[PDB]
Design a protein around this nucleic acid. Structure first.
Ligand SMILES: [Zn+2]
Length: 459
RNA sequence: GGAUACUAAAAUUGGAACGAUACAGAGUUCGCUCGUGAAGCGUUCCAUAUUUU
């Protein structure tokens, strides 16, 4: 599990850990993380050593008969049904000494048809951009054309959207089998029209930790092709993270996050107001993801980026987007939605309101956003999208930002002091670069013109 | 007949402690020598948190 690397280095593939010397590698091998990885790998290896693969039995029969039959050959640990095909099964025996008892006789039968039992071959244990981006943008007309082309490139293709729809339909079918009358609402980066390649799909279940564990068990056992299922109650809204293998996707399933559905609807409505907010949001999201400020864990999530863009568009002297106060005022009949204490309403249609009085191009908006976000205070200034100004929060530090619909979650509470300072410095750098003349106009035969330096693979 | 399941301590950040690596500085008998750091790391400990939109 150790591979040699130059400079006298080593790499543990069991933990994916690179060490520059020998004592560090030895200390890592002496730690509890590597020991636990070894123990879990050995447990999986032993289970594979005491398991068999059964196929050939006729369809429309359950694995209960298989378990009852195999119980005659000693203790049986588990029987796992096939997923996505439903044609075979994996029988994990209790004791190793009984495995050969399964291998003693191959004359198997179930419902008349004959079967086929084999030893389980042990699969090897597994431990649990910037080229095309600069390629397909630098031949556009101007920076606005660059941002429009970036939107076109980052937009999910028909294949990805249809695949996500298929996943949603499968989840709905399974959960309707388990919970009749339930609905699986897709949302996240799928219905808000701000869809990027390799985005997260969130699934709201419309009908404490027991339900979360039940959903996790459903995903682990019955739902096809889904591995990496992790329940997470330690959050404002408990969520099951799930990964899907055949699609190579990863997403989140929530039970009570009803506000996020209307949040995604509002994001889509804001995107449909005009053809400039969407390019601005896509460009700023790409810039954040290309400068080490949008990743996993304590880093600024994709939703906070769109929230900041909407707030900035609200704060302009010519109102690009009316604030959430006006949006709530624009609501009509059948639009009295309110969840979790407070009320937040907005129209569900697009052609109901007045177009904005802004005419600035995309480059001007980007430069103004960079200047404003660089100059703004980060110590104790909380941004209110509902009122569209600056000054109920729960926890905040060097970054203050709350939802305009969920007025209790400070979405900026996932950024520490150093990350906030780096963000402010990057904003100042982008602002001065936009003020500089090189960014303002085109270079034909290669200079990294326009948005490319902001989108370059920097450090 | 038709392709051999992702089972506990799932993660990162704030503070830490210890062990090493770096020398645009110099020498060497080729063993290293003098002193100074957090770049990458490893081990362990305490978490008014996040990682979903
Ligand atoms: Zn290891």
């Amino acid at each position: 599990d150790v591979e040699s690397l130059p400079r006298g280095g080593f790499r543990c593939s069991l933990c994916h850990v690179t060490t520059a010397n020998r004592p560090s590698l030895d200390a890592h091998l002496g730690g509890r993380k590597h020991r636990h990885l070894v123990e879990l790998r050995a447990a999986r290896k032993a289970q594979g050593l005491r398991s068999v693969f059964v196929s050939g039995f006729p369809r429309d029969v359950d694995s209960a008969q298989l378990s009852e039959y195999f119980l005659a050959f000693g203790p049986v640990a588990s029987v796992v049904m096939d997923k996505d095909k439903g044609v075979f099964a994996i029988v994990e025996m209790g004791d190793v000494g009984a495995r050969e008892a399964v291998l003693s006789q191959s004359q198997h039968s179930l419902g008349g048809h004959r079967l086929r039992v084999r030893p389980r071959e042990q699969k090897e244990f597994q431990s649990p951009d910037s080229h095309q981006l600069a390629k397909a943008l630098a031949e556009a007309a101007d920076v606005g054309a660059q941002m429009i082309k970036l939107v076109g490139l980052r937009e999910l293709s028909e294949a990805e959207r249809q695949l996500r729809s298929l996943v949603v339909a499968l989840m709905q079918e399974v959960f309707t089998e388990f919970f009749p009358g339930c609905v699986v609402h897709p949302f996240g980066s799928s219905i808000n029209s701000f869809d990027v390649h390799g985005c997260d799909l969130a699934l709201f279940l419309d009908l404490g930790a027991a339900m979360l564990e039940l959903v996790g068990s459903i995903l682990r056992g019955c739902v096809p092709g889904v591995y990496r299922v992790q329940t997470v109650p330690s959050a404002r809204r408990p969520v099951v993270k799930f990964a899907h293998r055949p699609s190579g996707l990863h997403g989140d399933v929530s039970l009570s996050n009803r506000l996020a559905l209307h949040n995604s609807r509002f994001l889509s409505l804001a995107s449909e107001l005009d053809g400039r907010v969407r390019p601005l949001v896509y460009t700023l999201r790409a810039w954040a993801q290309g400068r080490g400020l949008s990743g996993s864990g304590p880093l600024l999530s994709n939703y906070a980026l769109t929230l900041l863009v909407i707030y900035f568009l609200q704060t302009r002297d010519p109102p690009v987007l009316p604030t959430v106060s006006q949006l709530t005022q624009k609501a009509g009949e059948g639009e009295q939605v309110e969840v979790d204490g407070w009320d937040c309403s907005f129209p569900r249609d697009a052609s109901r309101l007045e177009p904005s009085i802004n005419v600035e191009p995309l480059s001007s908006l980007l430069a103004q956003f960079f200047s404003a976000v660089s100059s703004w205070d980060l110590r104790g200034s909380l941004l209110s999208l509902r009122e569209g100004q600056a000054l109920e929060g729960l926890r905040l530090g060097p970054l203050n930002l709350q939802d305009p619909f969920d007025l209790s979650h400070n979405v900026a509470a996932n950024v520490t002091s150093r990350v906030a300072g780096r963000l402010q410095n990057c904003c100042r750098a982008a602002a001065n670069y936009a003020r500089s003349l090189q960014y303002q106009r085109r270079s034909s035969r290669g200079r990294d013109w326009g948005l490319l330096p902001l989108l370059q693979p920097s450090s």
